[PDB]
Amino acid sequence: QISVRGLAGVENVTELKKNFNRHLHFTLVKDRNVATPRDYYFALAHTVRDHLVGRWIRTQQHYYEKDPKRIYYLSLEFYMGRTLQNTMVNLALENACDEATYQLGLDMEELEEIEEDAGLGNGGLGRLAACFLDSMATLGLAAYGYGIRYEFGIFNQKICGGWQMEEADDWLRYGNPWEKARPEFTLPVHFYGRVEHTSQGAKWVDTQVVLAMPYDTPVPGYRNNVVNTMRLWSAKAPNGYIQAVLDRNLAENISRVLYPNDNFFEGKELRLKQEYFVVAATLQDIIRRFKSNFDAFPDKVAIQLNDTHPSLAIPELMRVLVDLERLDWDKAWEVTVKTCAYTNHTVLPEALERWPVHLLETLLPRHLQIIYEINQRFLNRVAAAFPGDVDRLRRMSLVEEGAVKRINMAHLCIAGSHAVNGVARIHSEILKKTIFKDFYELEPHKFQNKTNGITPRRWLVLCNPGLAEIIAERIGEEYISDLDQLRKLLSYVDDEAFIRDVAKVKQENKLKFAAYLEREYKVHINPNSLFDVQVKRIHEYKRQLLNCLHVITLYNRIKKEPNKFVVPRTVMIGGKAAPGYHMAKMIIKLITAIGDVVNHDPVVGDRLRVIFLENYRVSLAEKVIPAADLSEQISTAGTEASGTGNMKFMLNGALTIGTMDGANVEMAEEAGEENFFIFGMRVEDVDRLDQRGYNAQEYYDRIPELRQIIEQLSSGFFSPKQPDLFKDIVNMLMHHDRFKVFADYEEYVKCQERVSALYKNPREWTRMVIRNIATSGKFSSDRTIAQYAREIWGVEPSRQRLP
Amino acid sequence: QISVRGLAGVENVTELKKNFNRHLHFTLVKDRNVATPRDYYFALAHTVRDHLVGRWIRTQQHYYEKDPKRIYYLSLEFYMGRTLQNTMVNLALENACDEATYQLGLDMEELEEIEEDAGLGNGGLGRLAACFLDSMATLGLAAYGYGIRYEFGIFNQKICGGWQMEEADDWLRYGNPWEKARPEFTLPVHFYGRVEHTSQGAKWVDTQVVLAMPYDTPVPGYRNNVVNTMRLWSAKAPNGYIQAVLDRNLAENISRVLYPNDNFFEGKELRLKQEYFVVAATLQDIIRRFKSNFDAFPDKVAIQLNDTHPSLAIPELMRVLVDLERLDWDKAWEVTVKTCAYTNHTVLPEALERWPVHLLETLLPRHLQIIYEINQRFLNRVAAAFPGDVDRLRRMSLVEEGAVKRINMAHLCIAGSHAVNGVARIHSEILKKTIFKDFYELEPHKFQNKTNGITPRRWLVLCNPGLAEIIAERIGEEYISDLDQLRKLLSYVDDEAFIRDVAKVKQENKLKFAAYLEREYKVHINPNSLFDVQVKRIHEYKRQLLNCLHVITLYNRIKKEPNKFVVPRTVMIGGKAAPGYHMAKMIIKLITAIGDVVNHDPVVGDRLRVIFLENYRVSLAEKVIPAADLSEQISTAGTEASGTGNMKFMLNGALTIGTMDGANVEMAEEAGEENFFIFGMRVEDVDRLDQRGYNAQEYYDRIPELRQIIEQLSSGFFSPKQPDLFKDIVNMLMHHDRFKVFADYEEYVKCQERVSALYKNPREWTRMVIRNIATSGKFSSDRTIAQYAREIWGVEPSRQRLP
């Protein structure tokens, strides 16, 4: 009955039932007597997949004939989630498939739950790539995503005894209908070896070969008949005896598993192999397609680098042009810089990729030679521009001196790219001011901003059809790919029916999430409570620990004054910790340990509950975000480059409690600061504390309620059977806290009081929500991609449909 | 135009073209502009596959409703070859598909060459399993093949510098249309651990688990609408961090690769794991299906053991019945023996499986306990039957004493089976007389013969349609599944048209094979020469070396008397050597080295050529066997249990030169010895030499032409650049030859003179061929399987069609 889900035409429904039954028979080899639920999911998936094929063939033929400039988005991560619902939405088939399956006696939503996530990313950076593929198709760009087909994605998180456990994410176990292997496009990638010199120049010889086999996945645009491609590479061995065959596993391990580090450089050789594996195969593919003079190469090709992870594209392109195509160095370098552009995602120093020179020398000897030549010529430019500024040369160099000499891969990216961008206004400004100040002064024209975004298909129409419908009832459907049209909703801030309908939808979403938790985990939550949600990867800089301190404050205040009314809350925290990150793992145990006390105190009862949401991932975000009342975005000012979870909550009818960090600043600017719960130190205040020295003891000595909590943690109140369980957390907070948790405690608690005060007035809570939804339009990834296309790639977007 | 290939009906051809184009689009995602040859092969394969589905569903439903006794054929090898042509032949679609592809502008035979062999066997034993699956379907038996889905089959053989090179057989690289994964039937298999005791009895605990995922392949009967199943199991891991995920490879290595030992026991733990892996999963499957008292288990189940490789089925069945179903030991043993039967394939002692007790104790502790209990109770029966015969107890025991104590797996099989059979009359008699004499005296009723056979679908209709057609022109098509009808052909021994037609067909086949060698290897052979062919695995007992001595004899005789006419020959030898088998590898180099001299001597020219056929496998046998004039079957009497290559040559119009060994004896009995080129020691003569001692020097001292050749090998005539290359071959022949090559040299050379003499008379050569083809009917695997069904399994075969 919801119009945004399309038409269920009589001949279309008849045909879908016909083809469903055909696939059940010929493709799954089943009758309705023995057919499993998974069989039914697979039949529907193939039925829907068939509707993509004509469009996919015709799109790629259209690009050959039109011959536009081609866009190549290189990333080690594509955090895609599930594909069935997204495909139906973009092809306008959702209502027809729902009716067809209903008539066959099946519930399509049950079938949808059987699909594995394609969890080929860690967090923000990986999900941005996925939103970008969707927006580039919707805007008619001749764009290709290039990455690795990991056999195992981000690990499955189980919680056992309050602790995170990791299990392999065997996502391909039952087959993936949404990929097509492409045998005729397999290519060789080279490792190790050595450099020699012929009559013609340098030659890379005596290498070990690993084959790269590509798998193509379709990427449908929104109701425009465009289907683009995501190409992911899989490692294959080339071809006593038995051990030799078993040892094929070693080369094949290159594509085995996603490294689960979110913001942290670990420096493993296998990770370096993965990076070169993607780069080498992708660039071969690009050059072949270009051929089917290199002066026009940058007119026909753009390569976008998602962080420094594919930075080897710069020396690899130079290697191919100089050593194989035999261009002169200076010509080849002109071409490389005009082709490549680099996006930076964080300022935290331990995230920076700095590879030991000995490791590169051994694995990629020709690339190290090329990097040294790039460095000499780049520093000669610096020396000419700033004569005698010797320390500037030291700071800007691609080579970092020390006990272990290393290559700074960010420096390599800036030198080899015609554009460098940060991911929100505040971040992009800091790059110019501080972090890459010297580079900005040499080449100011290179530095740009492209504020992040999210797709309103997955993150509104798919996950929250009820909200999409009430919006469409007032302003039509154009907003779905023109999100700034949501500003029309400000005209309904005093409209009784809209106020009613916005609150109705939120409550339906809350009931549905409550039912998921009861069904899947036998966990009961109070449906008449404020849903307070912090979901994102577990990190000190994101300050899940600050949330912890507030939850314990609410508990202690209840115990002090049991008779005083408080707004009931369900506090929900979720996200994965990196397997080797001890503090993050201790923080997860703290959250569950708080719950073990709070959730069983009879004085508290259902006035307060705290729960850890297991296995946070793209499909779970689609469930919980539409149910949220309060969005927790509480990183220390200066630490979160942008964020994108923040945007998802704003679009789905939650109010935000946050710091003036990342894209939070632009969100508040868009809605008006009066409509956001802003608190805590600004960047300028953090910097002032750093100048004098952060002393956590001062805050402990001055704040009675804080002392109480620290003593509870120390003495074993939250770990009775192991009193010293949380000693390391207490020690870090008191003496080694780089993120200043205690310094924002008082403002955070006071800001939360104001949240509860507004929640007591349902009408005014909803009116503030309307003012948020109505001003979320800037955060569409369509806007972001249009900016990349016009300001970096030199192409003009188009929402025109193909026949 | 050949009627045996079926009807090309107008609506059928139209529909096949329609569905071909549909699969090219929806399944391969291609148009006719970019479609690769492999794409076209895959489109035809899916089109043909769709015709199997209804029949497969209906057959297995029919077996549930009818509830017949079920037959389970357990083997570590299924040597299947290619599937496309076989499927078309059995469904009567060959002429229709040929016309459909022709009308689309494609050559179906080109498409057929793209399919990889399923080379999941080594030689005779593995190909017998494959012929048996075909015959059981054609005879309407409710039969299942159970084995392992090896990721890599028998190695790809390359010849480089005259030497065998091994490469991995990556047969699944592009996808296998002819398997269907079955997720809902995945089962756990257990390894290692220890035994403990509860209130109820023994319990196997603390094990390591490996999952077994089944893949089902359809097995079509000949034009009877029956489709049976071959179920092959694949190993899957159950589910710091990164290494833990990589280490999943270790469990998964269980199904990685076929062990390339043909007749030789190597005793590797990984091989033992493979054997238990198949047995455990298969028996779980059997027991579940039985449930969907165990007194009726043998009425509903037969388990056939293809050699001792799945012998662990005996203690595994006892483990399940006693430890899990809680039957008393004696009842469980009644059931086990009535369920199981064992087929023996060779008498060579080094082939016998004798596992160290320590290895079994560690990997399979409960199974070793059960084996010891089986042994005690079995020897108590022997002691009662033959009181005081202490050495008999030692000889019959399942436990073999020594520096390393071992379990004799053949002894385990005889004790735990209600029937034991050899594979040809002479072999089955020797089992009773000598090899298992003591067991025969205890239980004479257990011992049987089942002479081997080959399917006349693959090995006549498929590979030699021209011969199938000229036979059908005279006697109709009933012979195709009633091969004894070939005896009608004796009535045409003086028929001028049939004599003409038999020779015409052979010559067409010879032209086609010559064209294959020119196309694929740029090797030219003389089309007006006798094609002399020895194809089979390389082994001392098969005496490829005796063939070598004869080829050198022909060369030396030509050089002695250049003016004397000799019948031109192309001598062809092919087959694989086990990677660790040094002598077999040296024998391949000898063959190529002879060719390097013979094939370039201008005095010889095209009067004699010797060539090594690379990568002998099922698809290559289908090419060369129909082209052969002379079949070499020259094993030392007493060493080849049966043979089956011998049968393939007889059916396809070649005459045989052989010893009275294996099934050669029964072939000669069927045709009349006057129609076979029989030579050499009989078994009785070999035994007499063994009693006095084989002295090769006597033969060297008495035979001038033999001395010449040995001196040529010794002095470096066939290896000028490395004079001592063949010293080890000479040393073995002169001092350590277990197979008495020199003792059959003179009779072999004289027998070959008689072959050439008959070849000079084309009419009488062809008349002898007719007398061979006409009497090959006994060697149909349909006859073999009917005997297994009636004399061992207790089921009645039926060639009646399903609707």
Ligand SMILES: O=C(N[C@@H]1Cc2ccccc2[C@H]1O)c1cc2cc(Cl)sc2[nH]1
């Ligand atoms: O995987 C696909 N086709 C396979 C080709 C092939 C080759 C051998 C055996 C089985 C199969 C098909 O499953 C496939 C078709 C489409 C259409 C899309 Cl859109 S995405 C996609 N994958």
Ligand SMILES: O=C(N[C@@H]1Cc2ccccc2[C@H]1O)c1cc2cc(Cl)sc2[nH]1
């Ligand atoms: O492999 C088969 N079907 C696959 C089921 C499945 C599940 C996910 C993605 C792709 C696919 C199909 O290729 C298949 C169908 C038939 C019919 C036969 Cl007869 S043998 C056979 N295999």
Ligand SMILES: *Cc1c(COP(=O)(O)O)cnc(C)c1O
């Ligand atoms: C959007 C998203 C992220 C990023 O959220 P942030 O709060 O901006 O860090 C991480 N994980 C998943 C599953 C997401 O959908």
Ligand SMILES: *Cc1c(COP(=O)(O)O)cnc(C)c1O
């Ligand atoms: C039939 C067959 C065998 C067995 O042949 P023998 O001469 O009896 O040893 C071995 N390999 C292949 C490929 C076969 O087809």
